[PDB]
Amino acid sequence: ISPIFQGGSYQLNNKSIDISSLLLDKLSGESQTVVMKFKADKPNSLQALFGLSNSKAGFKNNYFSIFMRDSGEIGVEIRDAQKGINYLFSRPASLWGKHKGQAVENTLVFVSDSKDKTYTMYVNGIEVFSETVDTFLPISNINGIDKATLGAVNREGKEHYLAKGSIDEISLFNKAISDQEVSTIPLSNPFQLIFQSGDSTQANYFRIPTLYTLSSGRVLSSIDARYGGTHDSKSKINIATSYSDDNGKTWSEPIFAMKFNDYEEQLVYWPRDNKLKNSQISGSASFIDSSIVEDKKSGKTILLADVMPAGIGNNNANKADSGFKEINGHYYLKLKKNGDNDFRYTVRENGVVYNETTNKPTNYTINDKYEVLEGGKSLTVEQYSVDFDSGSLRERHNGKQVPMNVFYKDSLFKVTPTNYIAMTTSQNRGESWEQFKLLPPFLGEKHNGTYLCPGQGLALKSSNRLIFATYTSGELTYLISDDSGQTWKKSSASIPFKNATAEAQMVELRDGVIRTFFRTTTGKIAYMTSRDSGETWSKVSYIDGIQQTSYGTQVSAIKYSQLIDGKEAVILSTPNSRSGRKGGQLVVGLVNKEDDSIDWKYHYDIDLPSYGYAYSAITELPNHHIGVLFEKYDSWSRNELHLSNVVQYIDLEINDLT
């Protein structure tokens, strides 16, 4: 099939282009596909790209448009007043505006299909919505259509929703094209996906990217594989990883670093409507917020993340309990058995489940997978699946037996419903990952564990010291290992905030000198300095020239290997906005070599100030390029929940930022 119409080079300068007598006659049949290569870097707040209308008096609501918002949202309207139909479908954060000081060419494919009664929209190869209706309205069945327009919808003789942008190609087909035919449409994409809907994780959502350059040249990525929409824990979540052996050009199929099997790995399309979006998987264990580092001495690659027991997240996590009973200097995991109201057991050496009440070992052991064995025989539980088939979220047993784990809901022996940290290690730089182990508590028996700061750990350049920053209430708590991850001690730093999400990332400015950048509740990024290689920390200061919202966002920061303008350089990645998680920037800081202060000298614009940018991972690639893996959406907004393929990868050179 050829196009029924094909246009090219249309300038949308707040003035509509009429294409009625090129298109309307050729429209026929009830199925259509719009293919549109458009640009829009200074978009109006709301603006229609393409529009078919009844332009006559009294039929203002008789029209189809493809519209966008300056927030990056894309959508369609299919309206007909005589039929009593008024369809509106959209997805936030669907568009790119600008990459490297250049308008991005978006590729839009809208599929209007009468056989399935489905309206499907792709932008840039990604499906952003797909909606089935009871009563289908072909876009060309709207009664009295007499205008085909670009850059407005002609309503009762006047231009509505005037567009500022440009259309490079618009085609229409009297055919609803196959998914196969969509993926053969060429793309000029400024981004690539490392993790995506459909890959081997089978999660439809991803949050909290990380990136790290290993010594071999491999770049490694970790992420939350988030199953229950984009919701934090409590949910189903796994830590997935992927690596690139070619400077970011290609990535390996994702694997798991940490996983749980109490709930099935399901690609689900969450619930974006207001009655159902807060549906949140409630019976599953999960991992959340990973951080990665390489150990120089052993060659190991170390990855930590938070571990949440079935049904737990930071909201309901038992503060006032670590999950451990200390016994002169040693820490043991506490266990609660079925039918008991108190925690009567601990996991002594070799995983011996020991009864603290009667002071006797039992027939039960916990293996290194935290799986429960009775007299050496594996115990199992039945797995859960999730579905919205009944019109609300159901969590129900699915027939499959999986090894029974102390973190699960159906386990005979359960861990304290609080939050933990675990580490895994790889000895092949991310090709496999050893079974995770729980870190001991750092703040006593009567305190829940700290929360890991997503991103990178710090591997000091001239020692064997590893550091992972964590946060808790009223302090930054650095975890420090001088033995390849075997042992850990804490180094506390008081922060002048109560209930901060003080997500912290570190740079080593010169040997022994660490600057930590972190999120606060002040609308500003904070920082402190150890000159101690992390033993002691300074008071808190703030960065001017960057704004954050009051709740803040995770900040990522790296020490660039090369000199910029003759100075040592620090790179920082954050949203720069007081209005939302949007207006993302890599900001380039030159270290003054005398006092260690930083002149934040260049601000690079990742996309339009109005376009979403949230958590972010950066790294210097072996070729001195910068890799960015970031959430291209507002991951705080209750309007942008549950979007697929918004965590994206881009490649930048220093020249691009300066």
Ligand X SMILES: CC(=O)N[C@H]1[C@H]([C@H](O)[C@H](O)CO)OC(C(=O)O)=C[C@@H]1O
233 belongs to the binding site for ligand X (CB under 6 A): yes
E strand spans, 81-178: 85-91, 106-113, 118-123, 126-132, 147-150, 153-155, 158-160, 164-173
Rounded to the nearest whole angstrom, what is the least distance from the CB of residue 223 to ligand X in the complex?
Answer: 11
The only residue of 221, 284, 520, 635 in contact with ligand X, by rule CB under 6 A: 635
- Which is closer to ligand X, CB of 262 or CB of 306? 306
Rounded to the nearest whole angstrom, what is the least distance from the CB of residue 233 to ligand X in the complex?
Answer: 5
Q: Binding residue per annotation — 207?
A: yes
- 8 Å CB contact between 541 and 528: yes
Of 593, 594, 576, 577, the C-alpha closest to 585 is 576
Rounded to the nearest whole angstrom, what is the least distance from the CB of residue 539 to ligand X in the complex?
Answer: 24
Q: Is 503 a catalytic residue?
A: yes
* Distance of alpha carbon 351 from alpha carbon 262, whole angstroms: 21
Binders of ligand X among residues 56 to 85 (CB under 6 A) are none
- Which is closer to ligand X, CB of 471 or CB of 649? 471
619 belongs to the binding site for ligand X (CB under 6 A): no
Residue 656 in 3-state DSSP?
helix
Token pair in block for residue 647? 């965590």
Total binding residues toward ligand X, as defined by CB under 6 A: 12
Q: Which of 105, 503, 620, 634 is catalytic?
A: 503
* Distance of alpha carbon 425 from alpha carbon 305, whole angstroms: 12
Rounded to the nearest whole angstrom, what is the least distance from the CB of residue 574 to ligand X in the complex?
Answer: 13
- Which is closer to ligand X, CB of 309 or CB of 622? 309
Place of tokens 């399935």: 116
Place of tokens 């969509």: 182
Radius of gyration of the chain (CA): 27
- Which is closer to ligand X, CB of 55 or CB of 470? 470
Rounded to the nearest whole angstrom, what is the least distance from the CB of residue 451 to ligand X in the complex?
Answer: 5
290 belongs to the binding site for ligand X (CB under 6 A): no
Torsion, Cα 234 235 236 241, to 10 degrees, reads -80
The only residue of 7, 313, 575, 622 in contact with ligand X, by rule CB under 6 A: 313
314 belongs to the binding site for ligand X (CB under 6 A): yes
Rounded to the nearest whole angstrom, what is the least distance from the CB of residue 516 to ligand X in the complex?
Answer: 18
Site string (527-566) toward ligand X, x via CB under 6 A: ----------------------------------------
Q: In DSSP terms, which residues pair with 30 in a beta bridge?
A: none
DSSP state of 428: S
Give backbone dihedrals phi and psi of 350, rounded to 5 degrees, phi first: 65, 15
288 belongs to the binding site for ligand X (CB under 6 A): yes
Give backbone dihedrals phi and psi of 286, rounded to 5 degrees, phi first: -160, 160
- 8 Å CB contact between 520 and 464: no
- Which is closer to ligand X, CB of 5 or CB of 636? 636
- Which is closer to ligand X, CB of 77 or CB of 503? 503
Place of tokens 């997935």: 240
E strand spans, 54-116: 63-69, 74-80, 85-91, 106-113
Give backbone dihedrals phi and psi of 567, rounded to 5 degrees, phi first: -105, 155
Q: Which of 354, 384, 611, 615 is catalytic?
A: 615
Q: Which of 77, 199, 232, 568 is catalytic?
A: 232
Helices (H) and strands (E) in the chain, counts: 3, 50
- Which is closer to ligand X, CB of 543 or CB of 614? 614
Of 330, 277, 350, the C-alpha closest to 362 is 350
Rounded to the nearest whole angstrom, what is the least distance from the CB of residue 628 to ligand X in the complex?
Answer: 18
* CA 451 vs CA 61, 227, 436, 457, 551: distances in Å: 52, 21, 17, 13, 17
451 belongs to the binding site for ligand X (CB under 6 A): yes
Q: Binding residue per annotation — 638?
A: no
Rounded to the nearest whole angstrom, what is the least distance from the CB of residue 392 to ligand X in the complex?
Answer: 24
371 belongs to the binding site for ligand X (CB under 6 A): no
> Which window, 43-51, 176-184, 306-314, 463-471, contacts ligand X (CB under 6 A)?
306-314
Binders of ligand X among residues 497 to 516 (CB under 6 A) are 501
Give backbone dihedrals phi and psi of 312, rounded to 5 degrees, phi first: -110, 145
- Which is closer to ligand X, CB of 266 or CB of 501? 501
* Distance of alpha carbon 414 from alpha carbon 461, whole angstroms: 41
Q: How far is CA 10 from the centre of its chain?
A: 35
Rounded to the nearest whole angstrom, what is the least distance from the CB of residue 455 to ligand X in the complex?
Answer: 12
- Which is closer to ligand X, CB of 70 or CB of 306? 306
The only residue of 70, 294, 295, 306 in contact with ligand X, by rule CB under 6 A: 306
Of 526, 529, 527, 569, the C-alpha closest to 548 is 526
439 belongs to the binding site for ligand X (CB under 6 A): no
DSSP state of 371: B
41 belongs to the binding site for ligand X (CB under 6 A): no
**Terminal-to-terminal C-alpha distance of the chain:** 47
Q: Which amino acid is residue 437, in one-letter code?
A: K
The only residue of 70, 80, 113, 289 in contact with ligand X, by rule CB under 6 A: 289
Binders of ligand X among residues 168 to 227 (CB under 6 A) are 208
Q: Binding residue per annotation — 519?
A: yes
Write out the catalytic residue numbers: 232, 503, 615
| Binding-site annotation, residues for substrate | 207, 519, 581
Contact positions vs ligand X (CB under 6 A): 208, 232-233, 288-289, 306, 313-314, 451, 501, 635-636
| Binding-site annotation, residues | 207, 519, 581
